[PDB]
Amino acid sequence: DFTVSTTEDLQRFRNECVSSLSVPADYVEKFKKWEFPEDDTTMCYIKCVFNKMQLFDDTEGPLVDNLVLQLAHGRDGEEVRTEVMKCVDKNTDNNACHWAFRGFKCFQKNNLSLIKASIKKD
Question: An example of a Gene Ontology BP annotation on this entry (predicted)?
Protein backbone atom coordinates (compact mmCIF):
# COMPACT_ATOMS: atom_id res chain seq x y z
CA ASP A 1 0.00 0.00 0.00
CA PHE A 2 0.93 3.67 -0.39
CA THR A 3 2.11 6.29 2.09
CA VAL A 4 2.68 9.96 1.25
CA SER A 5 6.46 10.60 1.17
CA THR A 6 7.82 13.34 3.43
CA THR A 7 11.04 15.35 3.05
CA GLU A 8 12.83 12.73 5.23
CA ASP A 9 11.80 9.95 2.78
CA LEU A 10 12.87 12.11 -0.16
CA GLN A 11 16.32 12.58 1.34
CA ARG A 12 16.76 8.82 1.76
CA PHE A 13 15.53 8.24 -1.80
CA ARG A 14 17.93 10.88 -3.20
CA ASN A 15 20.83 9.25 -1.33
CA GLU A 16 19.87 5.74 -2.48
CA CYS A 17 19.42 6.88 -6.13
CA VAL A 18 22.62 8.94 -6.18
CA SER A 19 24.48 5.85 -5.00
CA SER A 20 22.84 3.25 -7.29
CA LEU A 21 23.01 5.50 -10.38
CA SER A 22 26.50 6.91 -9.54
CA VAL A 23 25.22 10.45 -10.01
CA PRO A 24 28.20 12.87 -10.32
CA ALA A 25 28.73 15.31 -7.41
CA ASP A 26 27.85 18.40 -9.50
CA TYR A 27 24.36 16.95 -10.24
CA VAL A 28 23.92 16.03 -6.56
CA GLU A 29 24.46 19.70 -5.57
CA LYS A 30 21.68 20.64 -8.04
CA PHE A 31 19.28 17.91 -6.89
CA LYS A 32 19.67 19.05 -3.25
CA LYS A 33 18.56 22.54 -4.35
CA TRP A 34 15.64 20.96 -6.25
CA GLU A 35 17.07 22.11 -9.60
CA PHE A 36 16.77 19.55 -12.41
CA PRO A 37 18.55 19.87 -15.78
CA GLU A 38 16.70 18.26 -18.68
CA ASP A 39 19.26 15.56 -19.52
CA ASP A 40 19.51 11.77 -19.32
CA THR A 41 21.38 11.80 -15.99
CA THR A 42 18.61 13.81 -14.38
CA MET A 43 15.75 11.95 -16.07
CA CYS A 44 16.95 8.55 -14.82
CA TYR A 45 17.38 10.10 -11.30
CA ILE A 46 13.76 11.36 -11.36
CA LYS A 47 12.56 7.92 -12.54
CA CYS A 48 14.44 6.25 -9.69
CA VAL A 49 13.01 8.64 -7.08
CA PHE A 50 9.47 8.27 -8.51
CA ASN A 51 9.97 4.46 -8.43
CA LYS A 52 10.84 4.66 -4.69
CA MET A 53 7.95 7.05 -3.97
CA GLN A 54 5.61 4.58 -5.81
CA LEU A 55 4.56 7.31 -8.23
CA PHE A 56 5.87 5.61 -11.42
CA ASP A 57 6.21 2.03 -12.60
CA ASP A 58 8.67 1.43 -15.47
CA THR A 59 6.20 -0.67 -17.51
CA GLU A 60 2.81 0.66 -16.34
CA GLY A 61 3.86 4.33 -16.27
CA PRO A 62 2.52 6.98 -13.84
CA LEU A 63 0.64 5.51 -10.86
CA VAL A 64 -2.31 7.90 -10.98
CA ASP A 65 -3.93 7.23 -7.59
CA ASN A 66 -0.57 7.40 -5.76
CA LEU A 67 0.16 10.65 -7.63
CA VAL A 68 -3.16 12.08 -6.51
CA LEU A 69 -2.49 11.08 -2.90
CA GLN A 70 0.97 12.64 -2.93
CA LEU A 71 0.10 15.79 -4.91
CA ALA A 72 -3.17 16.40 -3.15
CA HIS A 73 -1.66 16.21 0.36
CA GLY A 74 -2.34 19.93 0.75
CA ARG A 75 -4.70 20.52 -2.23
CA ASP A 76 -8.18 19.73 -3.57
CA GLY A 77 -8.05 16.06 -4.69
CA GLU A 78 -10.59 16.47 -7.50
CA GLU A 79 -8.61 19.31 -9.12
CA VAL A 80 -5.36 17.42 -8.72
CA ARG A 81 -6.82 14.23 -10.31
CA THR A 82 -8.02 16.22 -13.34
CA GLU A 83 -4.54 17.75 -13.72
CA VAL A 84 -2.64 14.51 -13.18
CA MET A 85 -4.77 12.76 -15.80
CA LYS A 86 -4.04 15.53 -18.35
CA CYS A 87 -0.30 15.14 -17.64
CA VAL A 88 -0.30 11.34 -18.00
CA ASP A 89 0.77 10.18 -21.47
CA LYS A 90 2.00 7.01 -23.20
CA ASN A 91 5.61 5.77 -23.41
CA THR A 92 6.00 7.42 -26.80
CA ASP A 93 9.81 7.07 -27.08
CA ASN A 94 10.15 3.66 -25.33
CA ASN A 95 12.25 5.17 -22.55
CA ALA A 96 11.01 4.99 -18.99
CA CYS A 97 13.43 7.73 -17.83
CA HIS A 98 12.07 10.11 -20.48
CA TRP A 99 8.51 8.99 -19.66
CA ALA A 100 8.83 9.64 -15.92
CA PHE A 101 10.51 13.00 -16.47
CA ARG A 102 7.85 14.18 -18.99
CA GLY A 103 5.19 13.54 -16.30
CA PHE A 104 7.31 15.38 -13.71
CA LYS A 105 7.78 18.38 -15.99
CA CYS A 106 4.00 18.52 -16.68
CA PHE A 107 3.18 18.36 -12.95
CA GLN A 108 5.70 21.17 -12.36
CA LYS A 109 4.21 23.32 -15.13
CA ASN A 110 0.79 22.88 -13.53
CA ASN A 111 2.14 23.96 -10.14
CA LEU A 112 1.81 20.54 -8.51
CA SER A 113 4.71 20.23 -6.07
CA LEU A 114 5.69 16.91 -4.46
CA ILE A 115 5.66 18.48 -1.01
CA LYS A 116 2.96 20.82 0.31
CA ALA A 117 1.70 21.69 3.78
CA SER A 118 -1.78 20.79 4.94
CA ILE A 119 -3.47 23.01 7.47
CA LYS A 120 -5.80 21.27 9.96
CA LYS A 121 -8.62 23.15 11.76
CA ASP A 122 -7.91 21.73 15.28
Answer: sensory perception of smell
Ordered by start, the domain boundaries in the chain are 7-109
Spatial distance between the Cα atoms of 77 and 67, rounded to a whole number of angstroms: 10
The reply to whether CATH 1.10.238.20 applies to domain 7-109 is yes
Collect all residues with Cβ–Cβ distance below 8 Å to 43 and sequence separation of at least 6. Answer: 97, 98, 100, 101
Q: How many CB atoms lie within 10 A of CB 48?
A: 21
The experimental technique behind this entry is X-ray
Query: How far apart (Å, rounded) are the C-alpha atoms in residues 15 and 19?
Result: 6
| CA distance linking residue 67 with residue 107, whole number of Å | 10
